[PDB]
Design a protein around this ligand. Structure first.
Ligand code: HEC
Ligand code: HEC
Ligand code: HEC
Ligand code: HEC
Ligand code: HEC
Ligand code: HEC
Ligand code: HEC
Ligand code: HEC
Ligand code: HEC
Ligand code: HEC
Ligand SMILES: [Ca+2]
Ligand SMILES: [Ca+2]
Ligand SMILES: [Ca+2]
Ligand SMILES: [Ca+2]
Ligand SMILES: [Cl-]
Ligand SMILES: [Cl-]
Ligand SMILES: [Cl-]
Ligand SMILES: [Cl-]
Ligand SMILES: [Zn+2]
Ligand SMILES: [Zn+2]
Lengths: 482, 475
């Protein structure tokens, strides 16, 4: 093709690739829900209101578990790639109420949202990352419709060969001694998704260019590996050694936490399909026959939307769609039910540490050592459930790891409850005895605008721990500065 | 063939079936251990001693968890079918120290160990079940080598067609409206193993012929199903209503327990293979049909798997098995630890002398139930011989629920004492309740031995008595 190697416009590909383009346009369907997933952007913590506000399979405790982090404001089920920027610009996680108009998040937040990344990294280099996210938000900076996730994110425009635009994934391949050119078509059919559907973190300024994205894979891809990995890479001590990494300090328990984000690749690669050489594209980009021929479907969505499960039957030819669906649900039902329980246990763990920190009664002689261990268990337990929760398959990508991970999560949280309780000489035991939902009610609603209202914050024991934000008018709506 | 319809002597088949016979003799290999299984009968709770006594992947807490039940005496890894009787007659679970020479276990214990069952049931009818196990133990009653599990257990001797000898399995098929003659060859290739590789219980006399074996499947095959099933079928109260079934009362916690035994069928049937119509025989009796029924992991090339998984190497298949087993084994040990803590919490609460909570009795009743349920759940996984592989998701989900139940028991019992016992339960459970490495019927005769461990100390000393049975020999 004659399309520019750096083309950011999806529309530039339509004329020469009408079939793949029209298929990619189906990502605009945001009306169908499946049993646990789907394309309606409901609030992931809302199991009270019906669709599309909430959902029967929402996670009630999310806001509590992320108290003090932007995810306490908004976090929704995902839509197709065509809406990435729209959703990016609607999310309350990015500050829209600051006078200077700053989002209070790094420009790195654009990293997995647009092909424009190539041009921005070319222009700004290492310095792009820590610029404010909202410095690239106006209509003259990005076209939400045409420059959202598109063809140039996975294809070399000139040859249409599979190509990585991703700096952090390229960093990883470089670090691990891998080489794109020597990789199989098969491996590439997974790696293009691994540019974005992974857990990541923002570089601390003591260790490299501020906010440069990193995939924390050096210790391995499992939750335990990541937990071990995150014992380093944080801020340096007066003595220069990087301490443990910290995404935020929980506003209730004051525990230094790690946030997990969509670890699809890490979860799937050692699962029953991933370990066998099956690629993301095999299930999510099935060959389909449309208008005279066989194309790679570019509708990247839930395979459960198709009652016949065609995308599975090129390998599971002897199975009916219903059978395959039931085997998916066989795992998801179990994973979802246990996840909710690991989440309650995590909340109780946070509450135990919070109660112990506030405990005025006589303490155990080894109080400080007990609390230090309790905090670490809160952090570890949460990293583990989040690793499963944040992952979009609800256990199907890797059933055994999901369930094993949830079980370890709960064990860690329970250990935090036990240690913190012992630290107070069991003074806080009675309180921790009830329904955790009574002591720490799930936070259904919480937004940047609401956090401006003291009388709102008082309505829940945990929101009560947040500071009131300055009374302020909304300054950004979508791409309009106001 | 001319072979008699209830021929019990395996050797009667050697002549017309040398190939299958020699293949079945391969079950005599009892030397190889795999990563988690194998054919060396090591003591399943012993992770201290060398093979063939212990193993690095043993379950340290078993004796504690079965305190008050024969399984506290001996429980070993399994050997091939050819040794069923030998192992049956060596086990300390059956009493060998009684003057009258009784084993103190029902003859039903023979049910899944010999074809002679057909003749015995024909001779005694339902009176057979409750007779003492040792009434059929002498050489003149059974040939340990020729009449152990054999050809007649799965084959109609005359035609060699697949056939069920099992009363309990036939009972089930009859109850559930199923019919052998209308069943697929495929389904039969699983059912012959389901005659024995399942969870079962002994009928309480109030509800049917004493000790008749039943497969508790009416509520479904899952652990929750069985737990619900066992809310009934126990002893009747004055109004004739059967109470909850109980296998034994835990000697420490005094909780009425349910024992799970080798639920291979129940576990595997809704797993990734079982749900897909794959049979036990497909993996364990690879194509003649190999009659070596053992661990498929003994074969580095995993031949038995590659007629379906042709594009995979043996190493790959092995790693995928281990991917599940290692996770299942690690979590099991933890569920077991939590179960011990739950028993100990209920025990400490029962003994508690301090201020009780006003709703003590209701809290304890729920705590006990949770001990019982938690244990049924881990045992369902532990007792099963695949260490998670037959059904990875159910195994792990089941272990997680088990732990949840046990933790609930700890919480309820603790709350019942107004938290007076909380400090006592805070440490390493292995310190407060040390694993019982060694315990036998002979040792339980010695008070000084019993004092060596806080839980064996809760057992009564058995009468000083000489051993009366060894193998099939009286003494
Ligand atoms: C790749 C390494 C990414 C980084 C860096 C950021 N995001 Fe992301 N984002 C990514 C994926 C693969 C997905 C879909 C999967 C999922 O579970 O969300 C998303 C999704 C979003 C969304 C929509 C869903 C929601 O969270 O409500 C938003 C609003 C979003 N992302 C914003 C966002 C922000 C603020 C980031 C910086 C902190 C950020 N993304 C980084 C991939 C990646
Ligand atoms: C990653 C998220 C992709 C996006 C964005 C786009 N494409 Fe794609 N494409 C992707 C994969 C993994 C594959 C399979 C390649 C293989 O060798 O198996 C493809 C394939 C194509 C092809 C080749 C013909 C076919 O198999 O259909 C074409 C012509 C193509 N894709 C076009 C295309 C267009 C026009 C896109 C923007 C609208 C586009 N792709 C985005 C991965 C991804
Ligand atoms: C960054 C450049 C990405 C690449 C490369 C891939 N994905 Fe993605 N995906 C990304 C984001 C930010 C989002 C959220 C968009 C939003 O507006 O919420 C998604 C979403 C998905 C979904 C859900 C779509 C739905 O209908 O619900 C799926 C199923 C999905 N992504 C899959 C997927 C696959 C298979 C990819 C490789 C071929 C892939 N994505 C690449 C970000 C990016
Ligand atoms: C087949 C065995 C699959 C492979 C290989 C991959 N995915 Fe998957 N994915 C699959 C199923 C059956 C589901 C559940 C769908 C449902 O409705 O429950 C998923 C889920 C996802 C999602 C979430 C979809 C949504 O509605 O937002 C995403 C984002 C996703 N998968 C991405 C993804 C990636 C990155 C993969 C390679 C690393 C991958 N999938 C492989 C089936 C299969
Ligand atoms: C080939 C590229 C495949 C596609 C497309 C799908 N599956 Fe698959 N599946 C495949 C392999 C190689 C395996 C492991 C067995 C092996 O030979 O190594 C599987 C396994 C499963 C299972 C069993 C595991 C479980 O979770 O119970 C299920 C239920 C399953 N696959 C379902 C499934 C679905 C829903 C798919 C479409 C979305 C699908 N498979 C596609 C190979 C391939
Ligand atoms: C079928 C319904 C059976 C009943 C009734 C009894 N046993 Fe069993 N036994 C059965 C199987 C499928 C196996 C091998 C699988 C396993 O996990 O053990 C066994 C094994 C034994 C063994 C050897 C292993 C051991 O426990 O050390 C012994 C000593 C044994 N069985 C004895 C025994 C007793 C005493 C029974 C009555 C209480 C009994 N069996 C019943 C199948 C079945
Ligand atoms: C169950 C535990 C069995 C024992 C004990 C014996 N056999 Fe078997 N046999 C069994 C199965 C599940 C099958 C497969 C049947 C099918 O239709 O697929 C067989 C098969 C045979 C055959 C048929 C030829 C073959 O496929 O090998 C023969 C001749 C045979 N078995 C003989 C045989 C002998 C001699 C046994 C005692 C030593 C014996 N079987 C025991 C199940 C079981
Ligand atoms: C009762 C009549 C049984 C039938 C029918 C089946 N099995 Fe069995 N099996 C049974 C017992 C009592 C034992 C333990 C024997 C001992 O001395 O410990 C076993 C053992 C096994 C083993 C383990 C053998 C090893 O090498 O470790 C396996 C793998 C096994 N059994 C499988 C199996 C299969 C596949 C069956 C159906 C075809 C089957 N058994 C039937 C009791 C009985
Ligand atoms: C293939 C997918 C299998 C099916 C179908 C059945 N079994 Fe299985 N079994 C399989 C594996 C890979 C293992 C683990 C072996 C190891 O060494 O870890 C097992 C294990 C068993 C055992 C224990 C073996 C031992 O050493 O004692 C038994 C007794 C057993 N399996 C019995 C059994 C039954 C009754 C089945 C049908 C219901 C069955 N297996 C199916 C592989 C597969
Ligand atoms: C046909 C009769 C099979 C034999 C023999 C074995 N497997 Fe299998 N396997 C089979 C099916 C139908 C499936 C589910 C996929 C589907 O099409 O529905 C599987 C799945 C697996 C998996 C993935 C699940 C997991 O536990 O990770 C594995 C790892 C697997 N099978 C391994 C395996 C082994 C070790 C076998 C020999 C002992 C074996 N399979 C035999 C079909 C059949
Ligand atoms: Ca979605
Ligand atoms: Ca992260
Ligand atoms: Ca064995
Ligand atoms: Ca039982
Ligand atoms: Cl954020
Ligand atoms: Cl090991
Ligand atoms: Cl017993
Ligand atoms: Cl008190
Ligand atoms: Zn080991
Ligand atoms: Zn009191």
């Amino acid at each position: 093709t004659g399309i520019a190697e750096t083309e950011t416009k999806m529309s530039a590909f339509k004329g020469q690739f009408p079939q793949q383009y029209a298929s990619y346009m189906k990502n605009n369907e945001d009306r169908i829900m499946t049993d646990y997933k789907g394309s309606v952007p409901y609030h992931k913590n809302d199991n009270v209101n019906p669709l599309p506000k909430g959902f029967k399979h929402a996670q009630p405790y999310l806001k509590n578990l992320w108290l003090g982090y932007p995810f306490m404001y908004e976090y929704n089920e995902t839509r197709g790639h065509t809406y990435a920027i729209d959703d990016f610009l609607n999310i309350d996680r990015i500050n829209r109420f600051a006078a200077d108009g700053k989002g209070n998040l790094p420009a790195t937040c654009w990293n997995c949202k647009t092909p424009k990344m190539m041009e921005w990294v070319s222009q700004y280099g290492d310095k792009f990352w820590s610029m404010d996210v909202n410095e690239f938000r106006a209509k003259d900076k990005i076209n939400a419709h045409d420059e959202t996730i598109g063809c140039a994110n996975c294809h070399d425009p000139a040859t249409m060969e599979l190509r990585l635009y991703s700096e952090p994934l390229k960093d990883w391949l470089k670090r691990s001694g891998k080489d794109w050119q020597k990789m199989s078509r098969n491996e590439k059919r997974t790696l293009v998704c691994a540019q974005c559907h992974v857990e990541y973190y923002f570089t601390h300024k003591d260790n490299g260019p501020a906010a440069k994205p990193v995939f924390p894979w050096d210790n391995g891809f499992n939750p335990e590996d990541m937990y071990q990995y995150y014992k380093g890479h944080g801020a340096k001590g007066p003595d220069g050694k990087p301490g443990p990494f910290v995404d935020w300090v929980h506003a209730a328990s004051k525990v230094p936490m790690i946030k997990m984000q969509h670890p699809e690749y890490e979860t799937f690669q050692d699962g029953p399909h991933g370990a066998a050489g099956v690629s993301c594209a095999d299930c999510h980009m099935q060959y389909v026959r449309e208008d005279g021929k066989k194309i790679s479907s570019h509708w990247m969505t839930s395979p459960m939307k198709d009652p016949e499960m065609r995308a599975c039957r090129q390998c599971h030819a002897d199975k009916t769609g219903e059978y395959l669906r039931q085997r998916v649900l066989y795992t998801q039902q179990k994973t979802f039910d246990q996840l909710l329980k690991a989440q309650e246990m995590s909340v109780k763990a946070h509450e135990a540490v919070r109660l112990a920190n506030a405990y005025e009664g006589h303490r155990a002689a080894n109080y400080e050592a007990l609390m230090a261990e309790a905090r670490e268990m809160v952090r570890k337990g949460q990293l583990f459930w989040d690793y499963v929760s944040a992952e979009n398959s609800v256990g199907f990508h890797n059933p055994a790891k999901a369930l094993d991970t949830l079980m370890t999560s709960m064990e860690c949280s329970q250990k935090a409850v036990d240690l913190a309780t012992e630290a107070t000489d069991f003074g806080i035991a009675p309180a921790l005895a009830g329904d955790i939902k009574k002591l720490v009610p799930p936070i259904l609603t919480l937004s940047r605008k609401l956090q401006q209202d003291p009388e709102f914050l008082k309505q829940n024991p945990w929101t009560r721990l947040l500071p009131a934000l300055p009374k302020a008018e909304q300054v950004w709506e979508g791409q309009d500065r106001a």
